[PDB]
């Protein structure tokens, strides 16, 4: 599937619900990362600076807070190609030296999807739109 | 009396922020961010020279938009984190180190941007409360200006 | 006037006051009940949409088109090219009727009383005066709204 | 037109993607998608949009056109449970189309299929049945009098 | 400007919007919150009443005095002699402060947004603009309120 | 000043005969009745009102005076349960009176008797104790600094 | 001191680990932790606790001391929304400390940092901001007058 | 008396009656309103904490210290070494005031009426008489509470 | 992390919530064991006497009831070293002949943690305190 204009509007609205104003953000982010480290425990070694050993800590919660903020920024720009790429480029820098495998990006991709679906319900979750647009976002993060 | 950002002030700031923040598009965020910077740059001539890397002199540049989005994202995360000070402190430390090792960026600039926000907000937000907004903004900046020059 | 921050303020206050479903019709009927109370002579200008009976389907259809126009125009406040093209379109529809410009001023007053009356004490009267002038300017091309 | 329950659903699903809080930007993204699609199904109708500069669907003039169309659709939908006012609203819309020489009734059917194809990509749990029940009546009334 | 009838209406609408008990303080706090949001620069003209802290007993007393002023002026709207004497009295207290008359224009905007937002949709902005002018003209003497 | 329960009673009986819905005419009617009374009790205080043209109590200058006086008493009463503000409100009124030479404290005690004599005639089930308990402290705050 | 909402949070979090249903045993476990910690940050203050046998922090006398201190803290916290009574409660506490020669104001700051360090290990979702807002005022008032 | 089972019963009944937040202040004020109703002459012994006005912050601070003392002492009921050391501490504070021991007996009666009045019909009066005697004994060292 | 005095008070209170008075005990115990046998099905062979094949049976539920009672006893003694060890020694006996691997003890440790966290919420779950104190408890069970 392609992350077209329509798919982008969809992802935006679904994300707005899932992410929300602020009260459910801690739990949303928790659910996502509990899934990442469960499916790929080896990934923890990369977060030694932000207590990747215990995602219940404030240090990691702050990290989870930045990651979600990252997705929010990209999703919020899915309709402004020019600015989206500049941003995806920034995120690319923040990771460029960490050796993130295409497999891990896919894992975090699935974590995020299960998290949004868990947030808005399997009843409305648009799988195709989400998969095509998140990959557009990860691709940018990995240079391409 | 006390300048402390209270629990009630936090609820108020988040309300002022929500009824002005766009959950789905950046058009609304950019406008507010850019507006603040234009205001800072016109009150602190020097400041512009700190955003060379993000094209500070080209407020409508593709890269300065990206920067404004990041500034607003960072402020959004903090305001929301006013409800959970533990994590907030961590988030505020990470923002600190991001503003450190950048000469020029001082507690002086933050006091200037505070004033900029105090001028921009009433124009965009409804029912804006400057005092409550101000107390929590400062609470927020104080964690960001930890290891900075006056 | 009507700088970017005021347009955003206006889009937000408008969305809240306009509401959804039948609430738009209520707002619509209040806007016009005020326009005619403020200027009783303006009612006769609307015989083509049976203004003699505001509950008639002919006039309610008119009320709906007018507020739908306020909405689409306000929604474009952030895109000049689209906004002006649509204001010119509206100008094209109002011009042949040789309407006295003062009525657009009455309209503005009625709209402010209606949005603020619905929105509450945080209504930004100045922002609305500035931005309405912009709308009126586009529809009448009259510098009276300069 | 259609029932109170059917309309309730349509109005609710529509407001989900269209409302006063939805930036005009996304409004013309849906608009371009809709009309681009109408053009692929009926290429001969694209010419009909020459006065609104359809040669450049990114032009202020065309963007305004689609904003204007989605705005009419919005009025129709939000008036489904007001049969009287909608009959009036649709007669007006009808007059605005008949005047456009070249407008074939069949072109309105194509639009019908386009909406039923695009909306599901946009709306959560799109109800093709409730929409068909409400859209069709609107469609017939707006294209009433077209050859 | 501000004929006998417009006065009867503004008196009616003001009383309703003004209210009783603490509702007056609330009305007053909204009014001043709006005056200062419309023009942040105007806040420093009130350091004599601790405007830097709006919940301060000194600034709340000022709030009460002002709405108390609006209430007595509006009540005397139907008696020129009494009304003009008080307007003169108020002018007398403000003159030595050498205030920019434009601030009275902002004040009026905020008053309309506050009474309008409280009274609701049937607020008569035209009536209030005309009558508030009589007041401003009386306090400032600035013919900008002619 | 006075207890919450006492002030509430006073604030209620007051609002009964004074509020935004009460015309200016009935205000100065109460205004003149009070001042006539004050003058009978203390004939020597009347000249203190020459600027507001006390010579003619039916004059605009005097009408506007009793109206602002009653307005001042109204703020006092309505702020009885907001001590902090009332202290600031009365401190302001005090100063405004201390500036006028010739003003004696006894004149304020007199005004109190006038209010306790005149009000019952205007209020339903006037409570003299709750009033005395709320008026005295109020009158004392406004007469602070007077000889 | 601090706001009703801020205090509400503190009082609630405190009661979570301290209340009439909490055995004195755990009360002196928190006490020993607190004072052991104060001693590491300010070794020179340990001597100040000689009359309560601080040489043996497991002694009935010292256990009783900490129980007594946590009990005072409990009173302060539970009185945050009673500014009058707390001013009084803190003045008394202040008198009980000034009398102890050797007590430096700075020692109270150290205690402040100790509480802010230990409480989070004990309380669920510890709110360092609401506590700082309430504790600091209490702290300044109890150490008011110390050199 | 006051065997281990009674101390546990007492800790439990006390926790329930003492409650949290402002409920402790209510209990506190009831305890003392009874003490002074039972022995009006005991009030004069508390001029140092303005007992002449029980709503005064001086007396409420005293009420708080006294019930906080009952709580900490009751919480130590299960640890002799800690309990006695603290009772001796309290004795050290009450001794210099040369207080008639009979007042401690009045205190006990007031405390029972207050805990039971708050706790309900399952109040164990015997257990409280036994354990209170232990508290009184420690504070006064008087064998009257033997 | 160390199972210090503070960590012990924490674990006690969190456990009290999670374990509770009695009404939620059946579900609490179920959640825990469904997790154990899911992650390590081979572990079932050790519970053939108490129907480890079907944890919906009363027989196993009774078993799950004893295990939780075991943890409750230990947690309740985390502040009485002397008595805690005597108890940990008893439990050690009850297992000494069953050949419980250090890996299984870790699995049951995680089951219990997920169960408590699921019981009181990720929002308050103190990961470090729980991990350090449960290991203190397992160590005792395995002699040391
Ligand atoms: C369909 O319309 C769109 C949108 O344009 C709008 O709609 C039309 C129908 C009209 O109503 C327009 O009035 C309305 O804007 C068309 O796309 C836009 O097109 C413009 C240009 O065609 C894009 O902006 C670029 O254009 C400027 C042009 O300036 C040049 O010419 C003047 C004199 O004629 C010189 O003095 C200048 O020095 C310059 O050479 C161009 O300069 C801009 O580039 C700047 O930025 C670069 C930085 O990377 C610099 O390197 C350059 O030096 C320069 O400073 C712009 O590239 C405008 O962005 C688009 N809109 C978008 C977002 O696409 C569309 O083309 C039209 N369809 C067709 C085929 O006609
Ligand atoms: C206290 O003040 C009040 C109110 O006056 C106000 O306060 C004063 C201090 C001044 O500052 C005034 O400016 C202010 O308004 C005084 O009572 C009023 O007194 C006026 C007189 O000034 C009474 O009105 C009389 O005058 C009118 C209008 O006169 C003009 O018009 C006629 C043409 O119709 C001309 O011919 C005149 O030359 C003049 O320009 C007049 O209509 C009335 O006379 C009618 O009634 C008479 C029968 O009684 C007939 O014989 C006449 O032909 C005519 O039809 C008035 O005489 C006004 O009614 C009172 N108001 C009230 C409510 O009493 C008050 O006198 C003053 N006290 C003192 C003694 O100082
Ligand atoms: C700090 O204080 C603590 C706690 O003690 C308390 O606080 C003090 C400040 C004082 O106020 C004390 O009154 C108060 O209890 C000290 O730890 C406690 O210390 C005692 C002993 O020091 C521990 O109990 C052991 O002591 C008895 C002593 O009895 C011996 O002496 C008498 C004559 O002097 C002989 O007749 C006896 O036959 C015996 O030799 C000891 O016997 C006990 O051991 C029994 O149990 C064993 C079973 O395994 C048998 O093998 C023995 O034969 C015997 O029957 C106790 O070991 C008491 O438990 C601690 N409390 C705890 C839990 O630690 C602490 O030492 C002090 N700090 C310092 C360094 O002084
Ligand atoms: C879904 C897309 C992702 C987004 C939007 C994202 C975003 C971010 C952001 C905003 C930061 C903070 C940068 C800073 O301020 O220093 C960050 C840090 C980091 N990210 Fe990601 N990330 C994504 C995926 C991943 C993946 C798949 C991995 C690898 C397994 C990863 C590993 C890291 C690491 C190791 C850090 C550094 C944390 C630190 O020590 O500060 N990220 N990421
Ligand atoms: C409290 C308000 C502020 C917030 C929320 C904020 C937020 C941010 C964020 C999120 C970044 C990007 C970090 C990254 O991804 O690397 C950033 C960068 C930066 N900020 Fe701020 N900032 C604030 C105030 C200021 C002030 C007052 C100054 C200066 C006087 C300043 C100067 C900078 C600079 C120089 C950068 C680096 C820009 C770049 O080259 O990318 N910031 N800020
Ligand atoms: C800025 C505010 C106004 C907006 C947004 C507005 C909008 C509209 C719209 C959308 C239509 C229907 C166009 C069509 O579908 O053919 C319309 C029609 C009309 N408007 Fe306005 N209008 C405004 C102010 C006014 C004023 C001030 C007057 C004058 C008194 C006026 C008089 C008319 C008349 C006479 C019609 C034609 C009614 C008919 O169909 O018979 N409009 N207006
Ligand atoms: C059923 C959905 C449709 C709706 C709600 C709709 C609505 C509208 C509206 C509101 C206008 C502008 C009226 C004005 O203010 O002047 C318009 C114009 C127009 N419509 Fe439609 N329309 C629909 C379908 C179609 C179809 C299927 C065609 C044919 C290919 C069509 C062709 C046109 C043309 C040619 C114009 C005039 C454009 C111009 O001003 O140059 N419409 N329509
Ligand atoms: C027409 C609406 C207004 C009314 C009814 C009004 C009324 C009043 C009243 C009753 C007082 C108290 C006088 C006294 O007893 O000493 C006052 C004081 C004052 N007013 Fe106004 N006012 C109005 C507009 C304004 C405006 C527009 C400004 C300027 C920005 C202003 C500035 C002040 C100042 C500086 C004071 C003195 C405060 C003090 O006592 O320190 N007023 N006004
Ligand atoms: C407790 C009841 C009283 C209240 C609420 C009250 C209130 C007021 C007020 C609001 C003013 C006008 C201030 C201004 O805006 O300039 C005023 C003025 C004055 N009051 Fe009172 N007052 C009271 C009692 C008295 C008494 C007992 C006397 C004494 C005879 C008195 C003598 C005056 C004088 C001489 C003026 C100046 C009048 C002028 O402008 O010429 N007041 N009072
Ligand atoms: C802010 C938290 C603190 C609270 C709530 C507190 C409370 C108390 C209480 C209730 C007493 C017993 C009063 C009595 O009944 O005689 C006490 C005694 C004492 N406190 Fe504090 N205190 C605090 C901090 C400190 C600090 C920081 C020091 C200094 C190192 C200190 C040193 C003492 C000393 C020396 C005694 C007397 C011990 C004795 O009887 O020998 N306190 N404190
Ligand atoms: C067993 C019950 C009692 C307990 C738990 C108790 C507890 C206390 C406490 C904690 C204090 C404050 C000590 C300080 O911080 O300096 C105190 C003070 C005092 N108590 Fe008691 N008390 C009890 C019974 C009595 C009785 C029966 C009397 C006698 C009538 C009494 C008379 C006093 C006096 C006069 C003070 C000093 C008040 C002051 O600070 O001026 N107490 N008591
Ligand atoms: C988390 C710590 C653990 C506690 C507190 C615990 C506690 C208990 C208790 C109280 C019994 C019942 C003893 C009896 O009365 O006969 C028991 C039995 C048993 N436990 Fe554990 N246990 C723990 C971990 C484990 C682990 C990790 C395994 C191995 C995979 C295990 C395997 C068994 C077996 C096979 C039985 C015998 C059941 C029977 O047939 O009666 N236990 N355990
Ligand atoms: Mg992928
Ligand atoms: Mg023309
Ligand atoms: Mg002695
Ligand atoms: Mg382990």
Q: Which domain holds residue A34?
A: 1-144
- Give the three-class secondary structure for G14: helix
- Confirm or deny that A121 is annotated as ligand binding: no
Residue nearest to atom 30 of ligand 9 (CA): F45
CATH number of the domain bearing residue B148: 1.10.490.10
CB atoms within 10 A of CB G43: 9
Give the single-character DSSP code of F81.
Answer: T
The number of distinct structural domains making up chain I is 1
CB E50 within 8 A of CB E130: no
For residue D100, the tally of other CB atoms under 10 A from its CB is 11
- Of D65, D56, D91, which is closest to residue C90 (Cα–Cα)? D65
| Number of residues that make up chain I | 144
What are the two backbone dihedrals, phi and then psi, of residue G39, each rounded to the nearest 5 degrees? Answer: -65, -40
Residues across chain F = 147
The distance in angstroms from the start CA to the end CA of chain F is 22
Tell me which DSSP letter residue G3 carries.
Answer: -
CB G23 within 8 A of CB G16: no
Give the CA dihedral C89, C92, C93, C95, nearest 10 degrees: 150
Cα–Cα distance between C91 and C35 in angstroms, integer? 20
Stated as kind and residue range, the H or E segment containing C113 is helix C102-119
C-alpha closest to that of F80 among F139, F19, F18:
F139
Token look-up 């009727």 returns C97
3-class secondary structure, D145? coil
| CB-CB under 8 Å, H83 with G92 | no
Q: Which of E21, E59, E85 to mutate to test the interface with F (most CBs of F within 10 A)?
A: E85
Supply F74's token pair.
């109204």
CA distance G66 to G32: 7
Residue I108 near ligand 12, beta carbon < 6 Å: yes
> d(Cα F82, Cα F76) in Å, to the nearest integer?
10
| Residue E124, C-beta contacts closer than 8 angstroms, at least 6 positions apart | C38, C113, E6, E9, E10, E13
Say whether B124 and C13 touch across the interface (CB within 8 A).
no
Candidates G102, G70, G93, G101; CA nearest to G144 is G93
**Contact at CB, B120 and C13, closer than 8 angstroms:** no
Whether H58 contacts G88, CB under 8 Å? yes
Ligand nearest the Cα of residue H99 is 11
Residue D125 exposed, middle or buried by CB count within 10 Å (0-12, 13-18, 19+): exposed
Question: Which of A5, A6, A124 is facing D124, going by the closest CB pair?
Answer: A124
Domain annotation for chain F: domains and CATH numbers: 1-147 (1.10.490.10)
CB contact under 8 A, C8 and B35: no
The CA-atom distances, in angstroms, between A66 and each of A71, B145, F110 are 9, 19, 71
* Beta-sheet strands, E only, within I28-110: none
Would you say the CB of residue C105 lies under 6 angstroms from ligand 6?
no
Residue of H71, H62, I72 whose CA lies nearest to G18: H71
Would you state the torsion angle of the CA atoms of residues D16, D17, D21, D24, taken in this order, to the nearest 10 degrees? -170
Chain A contacts of B87, Cβ < 8 Å? 26, 58, 61-62, 65
What gap in Å lies between CA B31 and CA A67, rounded to an integer? 24
CA–CA separation, H85 and B36 (whole Å): 64
Cβ contacts below 8 Å, chain G against chain I, sum to 30
**Ligand closest in space to the Cα of C94:** 6
- The answer, yes or no, to whether any atom of ligand 11 lies below 6 A from the CB of H35, is no
Nearest to D138 by CA among D103, D97, D101, D100: D97
Burial label, I45 (beta-carbon count in 10 A; 0-12, 13-18, 19+): exposed
Q: Do A76 and B79 touch (CB under 8 A)?
A: no
d(CA B87, CA A22) in angstroms, rounded, equals 13
Of G24, G74, G85, which has the smallest distance from its Cβ to H79's Cβ?
A: G24
The Cα A142–Cα A92 span in angstroms is 6
* Total number of domains constituting chain B: 1
Q: Which two tokens stand for residue I45?
A: 């062979």
Q: How far apart are CA E71 and CA E124, in angstroms?
A: 18
For chain D, what's the residue count?
147
What's the DSSP call for residue D99?
A: T
Rounded CA-CA distance E114/B61 in Å is 40
Taking the C-alpha atoms of residue F102 and residue F99, their distance in angstroms, rounded to an integer, is 9
For F127, list phi and psi in degrees, rounded to 5. -100, 105
* Domain containing residue A112: CATH number: 1.10.490.10
Q: CB–CB of F88 and E61 under 8 A?
A: yes
| CB count in 10 Å sphere of residue A121 | 12
Distance of CA C6 to the CA centre of its chain: 16
Q: Which atom of ligand 6 is nearest to the CA of C49?
A: 41
Task: Find out whether F41 and F108 touch, Cβ atoms under 8 Å.
Answer: no
Tell the burial category of E130 from Cβ atoms under 10 Å away from its Cβ (0-12, 13-18, 19+). Answer: middle
Distance, in Å, from the CA atom of G95 to the CA atom of G110, rounded to the nearest integer, reads: 20
CA torsion, ordered D59, D60, D64, D65, to nearest 10 deg: -30
Phi, psi of A76 (to 5 degrees): -65, -20
Q: What angle do CA A107, A113, A117 make, to 5 degrees?
A: 150
Ligand 15 center–CA H95 separation, angstroms: 6
Going by the DSSP 8-state scheme, the letter that residue D123 receives in this structure is S
| Token pair in block for residue A72 | 């929010």
Which ligand is located closest to the Cα atom of residue H100?
11
Tokens describing residue A21: 């104003």
Distance CA D15, CA H65 (A): 61
Residue D114's contacts (CB-CB under 8 Å, 6 or more residues apart) are: D34, D37, D38, D41
Q: With contacts defined as CB-CB under 8 Å, which chain B residues touch E36?
A: 122, 130
Q: Which of F61, F62, F74, F96 to mutate to test the pocket of ligand 9 (most atoms within 8 A of CB)?
A: F96
> Do residue G25 and residue H65 have CB atoms under 8 angstroms apart?
no
Our mutation pick for probing the ligand 5 site, out of B62, B78, B99, B138, counting the most ligand atoms within 8 A of Cβ, is B99
Chain C contact present for E5, CB below 8 A: no
Method: X-ray
* Cβ atoms within 10 Å of D129's Cβ, excluding its own: 10
CA dihedral G107, G111, G117, G121 (to 10 degrees): 150
- Ligand nearest to C-alpha C103: 6
Please state the atom number of ligand 2 nearest to the C-alpha of residue F55.
Answer: 71
Any idea which residue has 């929002």 for tokens?
I123
F-contacting chains (≥3 CB pairs under 8 Å): E
Distant-in-sequence contacts of B54-62, Cβ < 8 A, 24+ apart: B59/B34, B60/B34, B62/A82, B62/A83, B62/A86
Q: What domains are there in chain H, each with its CATH number?
A: 1-146 (1.10.490.10)
Q: Is C123 on the interface with D (CB under 8 A)?
A: no
Mark out chain C residues that contact chain B at CB-CB < 8 A. Answer: 3-6, 8-9, 12-13, 78, 119, 121-124, 127
Q: At how many Å resolution was this determined?
A: 2.5
H-helix segments, D18-145: 24-41, 60-77, 83-98, 105-122, 128-142
Surrounding residues of ion ligand 15, Cβ less than 5 A:
H 95
Residues listed for chain A:
144
CA-to-CA separations, G129 to B81, B143, C57, G6, G125, in angstroms, rounded: 12, 12, 59, 9, 11
Nearest CA to ligand 5 atom 4: B71
């Amino acid at each position: 599937s392609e992350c077209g204009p329509l798919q982008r509007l969809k992802v935006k609205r679904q994300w707005a619900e899932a992410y929300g104003s602020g009260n459910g953000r801690e739990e949303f982010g928790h659910f996502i990362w509990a899934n990442v480290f469960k499916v790929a425990p080896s990934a923890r070694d990369m977060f030694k600076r932000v207590r990747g050993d215990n995602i219940y800590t404030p240090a990691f919660r702050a990290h989870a807070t930045r990651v979600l903020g990252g997705l929010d920024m990209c999703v919020a720009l899915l309709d402004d190609e020019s600015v989206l790429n500049t941003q995806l480029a920034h995120l690319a820098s923040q990771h460029s030296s960490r050796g993130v495998s295409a497999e891990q990006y896919n894992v975090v991709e699935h974590a995020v999807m299960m998290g949004v679906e868990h947030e808005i319900g399997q009843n409305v979750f648009d799988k195709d739109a989400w998969q095509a647009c998140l990959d557009v976002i990860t691709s940018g993060i990995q240079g391409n | 009396s006390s300048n402390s950002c209270t629990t009630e002030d936090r609820r108020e700031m988040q309300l002022m922020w929500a009824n002005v923040w766009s959950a789905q598009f950046t058009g609304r965020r950019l406008a507010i961010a850019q507006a603040v910077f234009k205001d800072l740059f016109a009150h602190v001539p020097d400041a512009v020279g700190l955003f060379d890397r993000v094209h500070g002199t080209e407020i409508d540049s593709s890269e300065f938009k990206a920067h404004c989005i990041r500034v607003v994202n960072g402020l959004d995360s903090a305001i929301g984190l006013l409800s959970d000070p533990s994590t907030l402190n961590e988030q505020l430390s990470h923002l600190a180190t991001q503003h450190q090792e950048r000469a020029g960026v001082t507690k002086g600039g933050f006091s200037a941007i505070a004033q900029s926000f105090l001028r921009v907000m009433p124009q965009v937000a409804s029912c804006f409360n400057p005092d409550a907004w101000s107390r929590c903004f400062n609470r927020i900046t104080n964690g960001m200006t930890e290891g900075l020059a006056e | 006037d009507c700088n970017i921050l005021q347009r955003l303020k206006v889009k937000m206050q408008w969305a809240k006051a306009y509401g959804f479903g039948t609430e738009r019709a209520k707002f619509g009927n209040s806007l016009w009940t005020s326009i005619f109370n403020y200027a009783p002579d303006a009612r006769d200008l609307f015989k083509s949409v049976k203004s003699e009976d505001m509950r008639s389907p002919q006039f309610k259809a008119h009320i709906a088109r007018v507020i739908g126009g306020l909405d689409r125009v306000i929604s474009m406040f952030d895109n000049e090219d689209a906004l002006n093209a649509d204001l010119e379109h509206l100008k094209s529809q109002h011009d042949p009727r040789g309407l006295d410009a003062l009525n657009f001023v009455v309209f503005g007053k009625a709209l402010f009383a209606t949005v603020g009356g619905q929105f509450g004490v945080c209504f930004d009267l100045p922002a609305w005066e500035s931005c309405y002038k912009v709308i009126a300017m586009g529809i009448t091309g009259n510098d009276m709204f300069s | 037109f259609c029932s109170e329950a059917d309309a309730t659903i349509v109005i609710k699903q529509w407001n989900q993607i269209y409302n006063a809080g939805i930036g005009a930007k996304s409004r013309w993204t849906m608009g371009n998608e809709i009309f681009s699609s109408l053009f692929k199904l009926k290429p001969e109708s694209e010419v009909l949009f020459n006065n609104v500069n359809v040669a450049n669907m990114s032009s202020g003039a065309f963007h305004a056109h689609t904003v204007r169309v989605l705005s009419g659709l919005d009025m129709g939908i939000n008036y489904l449970n007001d049969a009287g006012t909608l009959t009036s609203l649709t007669a007006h819309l009808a007059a605005q189309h008949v005047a456009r020489t070249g407008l074939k009734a069949v072109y309105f059917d194509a639009m019908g299929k386009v909406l039923m194809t695009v909306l599901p990509s946009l709306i959560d749990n799109f109800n093709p049945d409730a929409w068909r029940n409400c859209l069709l009546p609107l469609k017939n009334a707006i294209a009433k009098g077209l050859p």
